RNA sequence: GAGUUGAAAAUAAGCAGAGAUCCGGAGAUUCCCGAAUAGGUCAACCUUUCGAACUUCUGCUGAAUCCAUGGGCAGGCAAGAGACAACCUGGCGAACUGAAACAUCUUAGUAGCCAGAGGAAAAGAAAGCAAAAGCGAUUCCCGUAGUAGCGGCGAGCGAA
RNA sequence: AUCCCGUGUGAAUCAGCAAGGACCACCUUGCAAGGCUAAAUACUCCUGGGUGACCGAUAGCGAAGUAGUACCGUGAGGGA
RNA sequence: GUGAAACUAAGUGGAGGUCCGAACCGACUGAUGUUGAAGAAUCAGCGGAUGAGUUGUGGUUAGGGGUGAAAUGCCACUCG
RNA sequence: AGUAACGCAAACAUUGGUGAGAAUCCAAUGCCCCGAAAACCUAAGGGUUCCUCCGCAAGGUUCGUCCACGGAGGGUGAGUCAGGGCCUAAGAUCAGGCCGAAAGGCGUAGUCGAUGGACAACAGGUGAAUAUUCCUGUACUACCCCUUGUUGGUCCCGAGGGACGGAGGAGGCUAGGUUAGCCGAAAGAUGGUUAUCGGUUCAAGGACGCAAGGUGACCCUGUUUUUCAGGGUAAGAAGGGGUAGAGAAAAUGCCUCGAGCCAAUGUUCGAGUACCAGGCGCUACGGCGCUGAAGUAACCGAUGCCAUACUCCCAGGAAAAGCUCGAACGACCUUCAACAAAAGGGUACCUGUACCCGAAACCGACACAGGUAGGUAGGUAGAGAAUACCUAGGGGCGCGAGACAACUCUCUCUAAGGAACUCGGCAAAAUAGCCCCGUAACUUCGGGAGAAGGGGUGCCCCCUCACAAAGGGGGUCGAAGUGACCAGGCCCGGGCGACUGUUUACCAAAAACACAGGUCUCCGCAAAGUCGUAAGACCAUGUAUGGGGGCUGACGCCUGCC
């Protein structure tokens, strides 16, 4: 069996479907998470992927 | 002949149960993909002779179907009564004499008859009496009327200008046809229902507490707390079509 | 009207030569030479650029991105012309 | 008016007593994402008939229906969208608490959520207060005053 | 009582109508069922000046360097 | 074997919520391990293993709820 | 407190090398481990961990000259591989439309959305890091140009097709394996011996074609109907073709022609002036240079192909585009414009490509005795992917060395007895594979059942031989013959639950839940019931032989009174 431990090997393009920017910015609730995070101050507001390549570094 | 181009493809996915997602109704989920069988209630096509080649099993009904051919160049597929001989010949119409298998309008036609496919009202599709081995029965008619005895033991006067496939319709033996295999429910996408006295009394009103609980209330309710005994469940003026319940 | 996939300033589609020794060898062993472009470029703007600017027919253009952001490009010229030839012109 | 190419030294080349660097006013550019807006999108990408998409305005043609409406085509520096800490207005709107419990009440029309809008907003020019004497739109402060009251006449609430 | 709404009934024009704390009579006051207006007024993400019986690296902004950063969480968010 | 039935040797066939047993899924007993190698495992056996199976990928139901072959179980090591 | 521990009990040891310093880094030789992996590749994830050089401040449960660590530089090459430029499922967003304090909810066209459908590349070499991507060979897609014809063509529309289940076993073969033949080498200090040791390789694709395989329709004759021998039919196959109705295609109805058809496999080209054992010449001793023999046959035999081939069953098995065919209606362009081909040339869209991926790099805070979809499946013994030992390939588990106290833990044996221990045979011990004999009570006649119980088993001879398995008789050893690993303990009663399953992830797997079956009760479709203020949705594209809900729980006898 498995253990109790929750985050495994999920693609991002499935992460990025639900906590990335798109159903973030298509409600009005998560637009205003978006207000908090601009407001706080975030560097990264999403964590998200990118259809074409990987990381710039 | 499988895959008729008659199969009609596209459904919504299998024995669902989702109205927002939430259950509403309950044990539902599992089996084959059960791909429906667009057939032809309301036969459009009067007049006009039709053989009847192939009994084919519908997965979505507890009897068969069958597919009809025409004299023009059309495939239809209709509910076939008990006596079916293969090859036989069946014409929907206004004055088409009586057989096992073909349909008319309620008003040209005796009563005492056997007869599956009714309507309740003009212009619907199939309505009454068309499971395996449903069979309505006509008491005289009237103005504008008909006192119809269906299969609930149950009469009631309807609009005389309703079309009717006359004829039992086949499959009786499915009253016999028994489920012993005891996984066979699931096959059916029908999963297991469980009972009111051992939930708990967050769930069902009868959740109890040591041992096999009595029903506690002063009635069986319901999970959402209607007496599920004798309480009538019907509006008290929706139409006074029916005579009497009879039952 | 015949458009680009983008319009991306034609005369900075290409940016700087490498300079590493198996570029040397790619110039000996393949009569290839490689250069930096950015990562909006083409394999038809690309090809149309060296054509025109060197005088050159070019073969094939093997393009790849580099993680540290930028993109390179391995550009093969025909056989009938030497890249070591057309290479020491420029500087390399 | 004398040295400069940011932090930030060094190096290579410049720019400058027909006035550089720098400062100030007005302009220009502003890739891509983001209202994001040609279409899709898994934001900073893809596909492209390279397009202010949609709503509004203007103009032509003008369905079922005669006039209409809907649609389509076109024009337009083209009006709106989006953002904004707090105050303000409008709507939904609690509960812990206090009453030594608690339901009327209080906390409280407060917090929170949504929408809108300006440097302020709301209100505002008497079908008003007052009392036989009089004032003259609204707002705010001191006061009356913790008064008159209201209230399981409890806790409290409290004007004019 | 005054003021505004839900359902339903449903007036009068100045010889009138409404208010003056149920309501009636007299007097007094005003003219609803149409709109628009600056000022005094409340606040700080800020900006430009002047101050401080305010702090001095466990304080003062969470943050005097990469500060909402490293790090934690799937995320909301927490946070040196 | 009788004019047909009822029924039976013998082959052929490969049905099963069949049996033994690997991968796989699950956790019945025992020992170890308890500042563990591990916030639930190791070792020795163990139950199912063609199904009411197991699993990947993309989804769905969201807290006065969801889901539950029903234990107050599970809903990100958190759930009256 | 300088105490426990240093992360399995696969195991290392020596000689050299480097250095200031070596159990730990490197090289060699033995030894040992995995080997349905502890091997190789890819999906996800990670993001530079990959490679050369330099360093040993911190990290490595020790050291370190080493490193997945620090610094500098480099590395990921695609028309064919995987996604997008194509299509849709679940689902999401939904123009208008309905609803709703707001936000928004429902819902149609439409558009996204792979885990699916469609579409074209294989072999050898190169290489500190890349290979279906770079080089060379042969190919294949999608358009243009060059030659023949056509005046209409494209899209929308009409249709075929795409297009689909589970199980079962039998064929025909390939992939691999073994043996033999052939070629080269070999004296491996031992009694004998060459009986020994290595090669015996080749893809995609282009052409030709299929039987002793399946399919091809009916009847008789011979044989076990069958493989085949023989006659007749004018439709009886794959397939074409005419018509008839409002009928272009299609569909339906009628008529006619066709004895063959289908696909893996196969021969040749690709393909040898490749690859390859070996020897030949120098070592920075890390490898390069020249030349090069045979490259066949048979037995097994796939879990891979034929193959969505047949047979059986119910629980009845996605959609759309590409593709093919085609009239009217509708939008646009028209002659050197459009369409269909035949050879020959030209052209080749974005992203991913390193590395780990049965893990030190992912997820468990760790360089963590745990987890992670998929592919390839060698030899011997074995039915086998278990097991035991090994080839390829990869490791020796990142603290060691002494000693051989008590005591814990993982194992082995134990005189005599055999459960006397104990809450309780808990745990250990014992049984164990294949064949033959034989097998009871009871029963739902299906089973129990491998009941129980007993015997043989290794190896050499012979003969009978289905002439492959196998049988009998005989001899031979050992105390012991499925001699290792592996591999049922059983019976007699009773209680509960009929049963297979499910249940408290992390103290309860049960007698609990479910179940097939029974009964009551509601529901006539604008159904009941459920979620939502509402629109509406599930019910249900179903219609009382159906859909809820209550209780009981197969089966057999019944289920009383109020």
């Given at each position: 069996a498995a253990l109790c431990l929750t985050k495994r090997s999920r693609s991002r393009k499935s992460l990025a479907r639900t906590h990335g920017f798109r159903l973030r910015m298509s409600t009005t609730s998560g637009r205003a998470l978006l207000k908090r995070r601009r407001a706080k101050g975030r560097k990264i507001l999403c964590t998200k992927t990118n259809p074409s390549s990987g990381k710039r570094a | 002949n499988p895959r008729n181009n008659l199969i009609s493809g596209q459904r919504r996915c299998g024995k669902g149960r989702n109205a927002r997602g939430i259950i509403t109704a309950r044990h539902r989920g599992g089996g084959h993909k059960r791909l429906y069988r667009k057939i032809d209630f309301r036969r459009?096509?009067?007049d006009i002779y039709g053989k009847i080649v192939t009994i084919e099993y519908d997965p979505n009904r507890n009897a068969?179907?069958?597919?009809?051919?025409?004299?023009?160049?059309?495939?239809?597929?209709?509910?076939?009564?008990?006596?079916?001989?293969?090859?036989?010949?069946?014409?929907?119409?206004?004055?088409?004499?009586?057989?096992?298998?073909?349909?008319?309008?309620?008003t040209d036609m005796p009563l005492g008859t056997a007869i599956h496919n009714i309507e309740i009202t003009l212009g619907r599709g199939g309505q009454l009496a068309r499971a395996a081995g449903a069979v309505a029965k006509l008491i005289a008619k009237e103005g504008k009327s008909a006192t119809l005895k269906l299969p609930s033991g149950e009469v009631r006067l309807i609009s005389k200008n309703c079309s009717a496939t006359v004829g039992q319709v086949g499959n009786v033996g499915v009253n016999q046809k028994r489920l012993?295999?005891?996984?066979?429910?699931?096959?059916?996408?029908?999963?297991?229902?469980?009972?009111?006295?051992?939930?708990?009394?967050?769930?069902?009103?009868?959740?109890?507490?040591?041992?096999?609980?009595?029903?506690?209330?002063?009635?069986?309710?319901?999970?959402?707390?209607?007496?599920?005994?004798?309480?009538?469940?019907?509006?008290?003026?929706?139409?006074?079509?029916?005579?009497?319940?009879?039952? | 009207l015949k458009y680009p996939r983008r319009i991306l300033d034609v005369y900075q589609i290409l940016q700087s030569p490498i300079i590493t020794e198996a570029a040397i060898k790619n110039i000996a062993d393949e009569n290839s030479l490689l250069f930096t472009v950015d990562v909006r470029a083409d394999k038809k703007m690309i090809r149309e650029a060296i054509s025109n600017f060197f005088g050159v027919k070019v073969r094939k253009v093997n393009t790849l991105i580099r993680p540290d952001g930028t993109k390179k490009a391995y550009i093969m010229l025909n056989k009938e012309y030497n890249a070591s030839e057309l290479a020491k012109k420029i500087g390399i």
């Open positions: - | 459009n096509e009067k068969y179907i069958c597919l009809i051919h025409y004299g023009d160049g059309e495939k239809r597929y209709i509910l076939h009564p008990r006596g079916a001989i293969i090859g036989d010949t069946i014409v929907s119409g206004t004055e088409v004499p009586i057989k096992m298998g073909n349909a008319l309008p309620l012993g295999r005891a996984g066979s429910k699931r096959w059916l996408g029908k999963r297991p229902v469980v009972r009111g006295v051992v939930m708990n009394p967050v769930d069902h009103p009868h959740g109890g507490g040591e041992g096999r609980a009595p029903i506690g209330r002063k009635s069986p309710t319901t999970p959402w707390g209607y007496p599920a005994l004798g309480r009538r469940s019907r509006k008290r003026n929706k139409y006074s079509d029916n005579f009497i319940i009879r039952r | -």
